[PDB]
Amino acid sequence: EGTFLFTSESVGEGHPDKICDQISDAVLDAHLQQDPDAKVACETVAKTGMILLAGEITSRAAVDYQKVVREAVKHIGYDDSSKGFDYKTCNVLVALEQQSPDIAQGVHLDRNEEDIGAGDQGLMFGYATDETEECMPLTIVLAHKLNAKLAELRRNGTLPWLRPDSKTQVTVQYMQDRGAVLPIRVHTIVISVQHDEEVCLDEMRDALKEKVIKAVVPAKYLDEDTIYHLQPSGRFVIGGPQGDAGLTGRKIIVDTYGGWGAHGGGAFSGKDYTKVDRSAAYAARWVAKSLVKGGLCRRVLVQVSYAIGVSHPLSISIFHYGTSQKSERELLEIVKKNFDLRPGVIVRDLDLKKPIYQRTAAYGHFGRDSFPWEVPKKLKY
Amino acid sequence: EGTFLFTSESVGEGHPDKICDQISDAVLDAHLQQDPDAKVACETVAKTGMILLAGEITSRAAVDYQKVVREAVKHIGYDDSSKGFDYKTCNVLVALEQQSPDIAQGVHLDRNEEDIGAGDQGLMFGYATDETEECMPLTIVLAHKLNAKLAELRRNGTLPWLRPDSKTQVTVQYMQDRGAVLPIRVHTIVISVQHDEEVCLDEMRDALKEKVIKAVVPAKYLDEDTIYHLQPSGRFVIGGPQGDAGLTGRKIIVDTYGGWGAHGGGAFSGKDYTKVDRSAAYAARWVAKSLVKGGLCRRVLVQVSYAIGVSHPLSISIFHYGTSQKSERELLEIVKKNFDLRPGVIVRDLDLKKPIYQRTAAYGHFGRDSFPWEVPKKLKY
Numbered sequence A, B: 001e002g003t004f005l006f007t008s009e010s011v012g013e014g015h016p017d018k019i020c021d022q023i024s025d026a027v028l029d030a031h032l033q034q035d036p037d038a039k040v041a042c043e044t045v046a047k048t049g050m051i052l053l054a055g056e057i058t059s060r061a062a063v064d065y066q067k068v069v070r071e072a073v074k075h076i077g078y079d080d081s082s083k084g085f086d087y088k089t090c091n092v093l094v095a096l097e098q099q100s101p102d103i104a105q106g107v108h109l110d111r112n113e114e115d116i117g118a119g120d121q122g123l124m125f126g127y128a129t130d131e132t133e134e135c136m137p138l139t140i141v142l143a144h145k146l147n148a149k150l151a152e153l154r155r156n157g158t159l160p161w162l163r164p165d166s167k168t169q170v171t172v173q174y175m176q177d178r179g180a181v182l183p184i185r186v187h188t189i190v191i192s193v194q195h196d197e198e199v200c201l202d203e204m205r206d207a208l209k210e211k212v213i214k215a216v217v218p219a220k221y222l223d224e225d226t227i228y229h230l231q232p233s234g235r236f237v238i239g240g241p242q243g244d245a246g247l248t249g250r251k252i253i254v255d256t257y258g259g260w261g262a263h264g265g266g267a268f269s270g271k272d273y274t275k276v277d278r279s280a281a282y283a284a285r286w287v288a289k290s291l292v293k294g295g296l297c298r299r300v301l302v303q304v305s306y307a308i309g310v311s312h313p314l315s316i317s318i319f320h321y322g323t324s325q326k327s328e329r330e331l332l333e334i335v336k337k338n339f340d341l342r343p344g345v346i347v348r349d350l351d352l353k354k355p356i357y358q359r360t361a362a363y364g365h366f367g368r369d370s371f372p373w374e375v376p377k378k379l380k381y
């Protein structure tokens, strides 16, 4: 009574959509290393034997797209035709043009940096929950950690039959406490991972339970009733882009809160800070985490929105789920007194010209590695 | 006091991401017209002069991709190099292969149709709100209708300077009533639309207020304080794929609830019913709308989740926001007694082999045209 199930998923570095996010952000980083003011909107498409870059870049950088793309694919682990994809021998196609001059003139040309317009309209949410130290939903944290564990055991040669493409999914039973949520138990785990032609299904299922799940999920959450769907398709030899076409910005819920909170639809990867889809979403996470770590609420949702060419947000909204003694109006006044959510100020506060974006493009953008948006602001009120 | 702002956006038929959704669904429909059991996973990429199809189709259909793609672009209105894109003369590139045999064997081969596995893992939400007759958030309904009005005035020659690429955004001030939400006023409207080189900015801004906003938004929601950002970039001559690379499944919040409810991350367009990203999301909307229209709640969120190769959902969750006298446990029992959320049963209930998908791929998948998932089920309990 008063309990509910909630499910989140994550994917591995070799999931074809995630390959595209990582390549898009490798391209962004390569530009920012030479030109901190590069305007980048780099979409990636992946299918059998092909990486295509499509989009708009205006930059002073001299970037070797062949090297940047192939080094990203090498890092992921696609290094042989036996695995379905090889950085050494794949096709890299480029359909990149300058940023539209109409966008440039409306957003940033002859603008003071602090007063640059939003690079697009849109809406963005931030979310934080006190249910974990990293202020993230346990469902998504566990799902990410299961993919990270697969990559670790592949890379260290423990499970050498593993290939880079994986997906995981975690269902947790929760109770509610005055709008806060408390995780009780893991109800169901799914793991699907690409594998070689030698290993049999029983060996894989045993290894996924004993060397992956048991190495990630605390035993206090697992019981005799927990349901395991391990290699539920029965065979996953074909994988990566050969199994499924990938695109940049097709894992936006994996990238954020795993179904919790809300999403405004904007993808992160391949975009410089003037694209508020990324900078304002990072800032909204920073606000949400600052409110929870500051002790003002246990759980909070922040919405912001923008118009192309306009610096200041068009709307700011705060929902505390009943977990603050302060009114949502009082929290909004604290946020307005402590934060400046113009993209040309967010860039300074969160250091968003730094080429750290490829690091964000797997295992979620939030809840790890003390990125600037994960370091709470000390609030004055 | 007790009021809040909430923002949603929509895009027009010529927005490059939406072009891709419509082409992906034109391809799906072309297959289903000949082979109701076609397995389709068709991604589309659009950039200057290029439509690329990438993905996996196993089908008995004989499909002319050149004709299907070009007819979709013609319908959208890109018919001349002056508009930045022309169905007659663009490049159509195809990178389509058979569905992975590993997926096919794990999902549907030698399966009874009712007992087909989910085509992937994932999570999906349904949402419904009594704030409009169509059980959708007013923010998203108004945003969609503003884009539909632009297309209408372009196509009827009223505003012949209009081009197909548009975006809109609506901020509404709401009050809450025991978990239900009541829209009070329109706080801010954004409209950006591609235009010709002849029309001046003041003519466009006047027309967008008088012939678009006033023709869509009831005057009772507008006042002297309503903020209008009309052509806020100042110039939008370059547009469509020339202005911004488009991809299938990059408008998933426009396609659904405009930030309300929740999203599990799955894109709809280009996918047959075995892909639960589409079929289970449609079924979850159907459940949510059935609960609200059945008088069991004013507002409701439904989560379901799946594992690849497994027919039945792994989890089902119901949140009524405090708007039911029934417990969320009692609502879950009503749902379990009235619905079968296996994809091989959803296909029968919602007629998902019918080639109606291109019609879903602009102006939202929900809240219009009495699609099967918009016709409430009469509930027995």
Ligand SMILES: [C]OC1=[C][C]=C(C2=N([O])C([C])=[C]C3=C2C2=[C]C(O[C])=[C][C]=C2O3)[C]=[C]1
Pocket: A003, A004, A005, A006, A176, A179, A180, A259, A260, A261, A262, A321, B261, B262, B301, B302, B303, B317, B318, B319, B328
């Ligand atoms: C988005 O995201 C989410 C939302 C909401 C939630 C919740 N909250 O918050 C509270 C307080 C309580 C509850 C809930 C739920 C949900 C469900 O399903 C979906 C069921 C039941 C329940 O209960 C969560 C999550």
Ligand SMILES: [C]OC1=[C][C]=C(C2=N([O])C([C])=[C]C3=C2C2=[C]C(O[C])=[C][C]=C2O3)[C]=[C]1
Pocket: A261, A262, A301, A302, A303, A317, A318, A319, A328, B003, B004, B005, B006, B176, B179, B180, B259, B260, B261, B262, B321
């Ligand atoms: C997702 O989606 C959403 C969620 C939630 C909501 C709400 N609910 O429900 C209630 C009852 C009340 C409230 C809310 C809000 C929000 C905000 O922002 C975001 C602010 C404030 C407020 O309040 C909505 C929407």
Ligand SMILES: CSC[C@H]1O[C@@H](n2cnc3c(N)ncnc32)[C@H](O)[C@@H]1O
Pocket: A015, A016, A017, A165, A166, A167, A192, A193, A233, A234, A235, A236, A237, A238, A239, A240, A243, A244, B100, B102, B103, B106, B119, B120, B121, B308
């Ligand atoms: C079902 S295709 C969608 C995603 O599922 C994964 N996938 C691909 N092939 C299989 C398979 N044979 N079994 C399980 N998951 C798969 C890959 O991560 C792919 O991007």
Ligand SMILES: CSC[C@H]1O[C@@H](n2cnc3c(N)ncnc32)[C@H](O)[C@@H]1O
Pocket: A100, A102, A103, A106, A119, A120, A121, A308, B015, B016, B017, B165, B166, B167, B192, B193, B233, B234, B235, B236, B237, B238, B239, B240, B243, B244
């Ligand atoms: C800002 S690029 C993202 C989207 O905004 C729109 N857009 C493109 N160019 C402009 C412009 N000059 N002004 C306003 N919106 C634009 C198009 O719909 C594009 O897909």
Ligand SMILES: [Cl-]
Pocket: A026, A071, A072, A073, A075, A358
């Ligand atoms: Cl790299």
Ligand SMILES: [Cl-]
Pocket: A131, A132, A133, A134
């Ligand atoms: Cl923790």
Ligand SMILES: [Cl-]
Pocket: A336, A337, A338, A339, A340
């Ligand atoms: Cl400030």
Ligand SMILES: [Cl-]
Pocket: B026, B071, B072, B073, B075, B358
């Ligand atoms: Cl058509």
Ligand SMILES: [Cl-]
Pocket: B131, B132, B133, B134
């Ligand atoms: Cl209505």
Ligand SMILES: [Cl-]
Pocket: B336, B337, B338, B339, B340
């Ligand atoms: Cl039933």
